[PDB]
Structures are given as C-alpha cells and as structure tokens.
C-alpha cells in the first residue's frame, strides 16, 4: 500500500502534469525536501500507475504530460485548483503550502474584515460541540454600546463576506445570528438551561429558491445566462436553510424580487417570489 | 531534521489542540494511516518541542490542550481554519483532505456557476506562462451569438463570484476581461504578434480606495463599523489594480459613491469618489 506522504507526492505529480503540463525531479525534491532517488522512485510509481499520462524527455530531462492525460485523483479538479489560486492571491496560504506550480499574475477582490482570534473561534466551536452556554459581549448597529448576553451557539454561518454564530439568545428567547467579529466571549455559563438546537426551525428547515433567466432576454442571451449560472434545463434550484435565505439573496444581488423592465441589470429572477417573501417574514419573527 | 510528512502530522496535532482542545492517538492513526507506535512518537515529538501546550490524561487516554497553549505553526491561524470550514461546507474538499476535527453544523451562501474544465484552465494558464495567443469562442450579453476572437492572456482575475482572463484582444486592440466560464479555447495561434503585458496599464497600475464609516453614524456606531471592516485609525485604505476597481466596488456594494442620507443602509463610504470615478472612466476606454 502507498503511504500517506508518498500519496501526497503522487497528487503533486498529478496536479503539476494537469496544469503546468510538465514536472522535474527537482520540483519534488524542493517541495517535499526528499532526495533525488526518492523523487525518481515517486515519478516511477506514477509511471507505473498511469503511464499513458506522461513521457520522459531525455533532451530536456523533464516529464511531459501527454494529450491523453487523465488525472488519477479528483484532488486535481479545476474547482480545487482555482480555489488554490484564490487562496494564494489572498495570502491565506503561502506557496510552500500549495501544489500550484506556475503562479499567474492574479487580481482578487478584497473582503475587508476584522481578523478573528483563534482562541475565540475555538471557544465557540467547543461550545457548539458541548452544547454549553457562553456569556459574551456583543455590539451591533442598533445596539452599539457593548452589552452582555448569554448565548448557546449551535452552528456557524458564512454570508459571503463574514462569519456568524447561530445561537439561542437566553434573554430574548429566540434563535438568531451573531457576527463573530463583534463577539467577545467572556466565560462559560454552566448553570444556564440546556437548549435543543433541533428547535431552531429557521436553521433546520431547508427551502428552495428557484432561479431563471430574466424573461425579457432573447433566446441567445438566455443561453449565456444559463451557462453563467450553471442552469440545468432553464432554471437553477438553489437549496438553503431558511435562516440563510436573506444572506443568499444579498450575496447574489437578488433582493429586489420584482421582475424589472431592464433585463440587462437583472440577468436572473426568483420564480417563487411569494414563497421567499413569506419565508423571510417567518424567520424575522 | 523533521521530514515533510511528520511535520504535517505535527501541524495536525497543533491544529487539533488549538480548536478541538484535545487529540487521541487514534485520530493520527486514522487520518494518516500510521501505526500506533508512530503516532505515539509523533505526539512525543510534539511534547518535546512544545510541552507547555498539552498534557496527557491517563484516565481518559487523551492529550488535552492547556490554558497556556500557543500554536507552533502559523498554519493553525484562525483565517486558515475558518477558510477550511468554508471549503468543507461548499464541498471543495472532503473531510479526509482536511485537518478539521469537530465539524459544526454550517450554512454557507451558494455561488451558482458553470463548473470549468481543468483542461481549459490548464490551456489558459500555460498560454499565460508562455505568452502565446489563443483562438477562442466567447459569448456575452451584448454579443450572445458565439464569436471567435484571438486573445493573448496574461493574468487571471476573481470578482468575488467568477474568474476572468485578462487578455489582449487582437481584433479590438485593447486589454480587457473574458469570463472563463464563457470561453471555449479552440487552438493556439502561433503566428500572432507577441504582446507585452507590461503595456496593460489598467492591470499594472495599483490604485487606493479610501473607505471610512458613514459620517451620520454616532461615535458608538462608528466604532462598530470600524471593527467590522478592520479599520485602523478610522479608515481603510484598500489597494487594487485599476482594472479590478469596478469589481471591488461591486463586491463590497460601494458602487453608489454619493454619501446618502441613510447611514443604516450605507455603513461605509468612499472618501475619494472623484478619483474612483475618474479611474473607472479611464479604464473603460
């Protein structure tokens, strides 16, 4: 059997062949800090497992991907690789943490936010896991003077820009959202009443947002929008938690539910506008 | 010296102690498919390198993080770990590809898009690296009937939802953007004129968007906004390529430059509105 480390080196060969179209022994030696004989043995094992993927060129002393290349691992897929380029450009990871070979010039939009402390995220995650209540300070636009609350968190949500904790608010007796960047966790409240998170109907009930191309588009433009949004059969059925519906519409700029008279500024419309309106009124209550 | 594999296992111990607050030998054995003696040796090496971070509890047979814990690697930082939770929830990676231990219930907004083929991304990346021209089919809202162009790509951009190639358009004689999900790459055009990407002024000129809290906010609300946006000293200086300015403003909902009379719907305003307007007119030209 192939051990975990060597398998990661086979993944590295596979992804370099897929995107760079070539790999040298020295690329393996430098990334993984292995010897020339081990790196040659890794390339030999890749040749044994998937010989049609690559040829060795003795003039250039390099392995070249063939036109027949097929990745041996799903970890070489395009969504993952584009996500890696985003993480490198945003500085989330360093080049020595990534299998990416050629790094193109990249421009990625910036999401300005408060850097969160690991210790606070950790306290929240463990409180979720252990179903325990936390005394916190929280400040908001409607209540900017920091105020203390007792919260029992049970989930995390990401709205496209920032994270929030989904939690029972013991004072207001509701499940609701708390931006993690606005929370100061102070101590545990072990005497608080246990909360059943299965009672958070907004979090646990999934709903469907049915999206279609704006009906004022020509058939040719419709096909463009369909391809842009990965629509199968002329619509896109987006599934989300009811308590994530508002965030989802904001993330996709779908908050204006009416079908406008301007197709060019509204490529996609929500088919089930009345369901969506109703679901948001229920959840904000 | 510690080898690459064992160092990844030390990283795994560090991140489990930071967020789960505990780790068992069997967690290492199962994730990395190693023997009990090797996993014990990894935990012993972690104890040697950072003994104040953890204690072994013989009653529970588990290693517990201490209140004094300090991560031995920056790879345990919170931005990375929250990014991992996002990638797991979006299905970008599988649990066996991630060091995340406890996985909370998560809700993440959905970005509907066309799944891109690795082979097309690969052809584009290599064309960027080798500075070669490509014959492509492209369809857009303004020109929906697929049309062929000769493009020399030199960079990639991400607008918050989708990727584009930055490229010289040989027919229209301009540098401009092409959504990768709308591109069909057909063949290389080796007889085309070479293009100097240093002549793409929009791509290479960085500009500053100066952001401040809306001036109608009370001082207490201002402090909330400042914390939300990670503002140092009452403003945020966002740096981006001129050719990414429009995408940046759209991603942050800053396209309406005027200072509105409604602080609650416009938490942040652009200080240098006239510079930004001018820079966008230059770039769309």
Author numbering:
A (entry chain A), B (entry chain A): 8 to 292
What does the paper say about this structure?
Here, we identify a novel transcription factor, CapW, that is associated with hundreds of distinct CBASS systems. We show that CapW is a transcriptional repressor that binds the promoter region of its cognate CBASS operon to inhibit expression of CBASS genes. Two structures of CapW from different bacteria reveal a dimeric assembly that likely binds a small-molecule ligand to control DNA binding and transcriptional repression. Our two structures suggest that ligand binding to the protein's WYL domain causes a conformational change in the WYL and WCX domains that triggers a large-scale rotation of the wHTH domains to release the protein from DNA.
We next crystallized and determined the structure of Sm CapW to 1.89 Å resolution. As expected from our SEC-MALS analysis, CapW crystallized as a homodimer with each chain possessing an N-terminal wHTH domain, a central WYL domain, and a C-terminal WCX domain. The CapW homodimer adopts a distinctive domain-swapped overall architecture with the N-terminal wHTH domains adjacent to one another, followed by extended linkers reaching across the dimer such that each protomer's WYL domain interacts primarily with the wHTH domain of the opposite protomer. The C-terminal WCX domain adopts an extended α–β fold, and each protomer's WCX domain reaches back across the top of the dimer to interact with the WYL domain of the opposite protomer. The two WCX domains define a groove across the top of the CapW dimer that extends between the putative ligand-binding sites of each WYL domain (see next section). In DNA-free structures of both CapW and BrxR, the wHTH domains of the two protomers are positioned adjacent to one another, with their DNA-binding surfaces aligned on one face of the dimer. We modelled a DNA-bound structure of CapW based on a structure of Acinetobacter BrxR bound to its cognate palindromic DNA sequence, revealing that the two wHTH domains in the CapW dimer are perfectly aligned to bind a palindromic DNA sequence ∼20 base pairs in length, close to the length of palindromic sequences we identified as CapW binding sites. In Sm CapW, both CapWR32A and CapWSQS-AAA eliminated detectable binding of the protein to its binding site in the CBASS promoter. Together, these data suggest that our structure of Sm CapW represents a DNA-binding competent conformation of CapW. In CapW, the tryptophan residue is highly conserved, while the typical tyrosine residue in WYL domains is replaced by a highly conserved histidine (His171 in Sm CapW). This histidine residue is solvent-exposed on the top face of the CapW dimer, and is surrounded by a cluster of highly-conserved hydrophobic and polar residues including Tyr145, Ser147, Trp156, Arg169, Arg183, Phe185 and Arg189 (Sm CapW residue numbering).
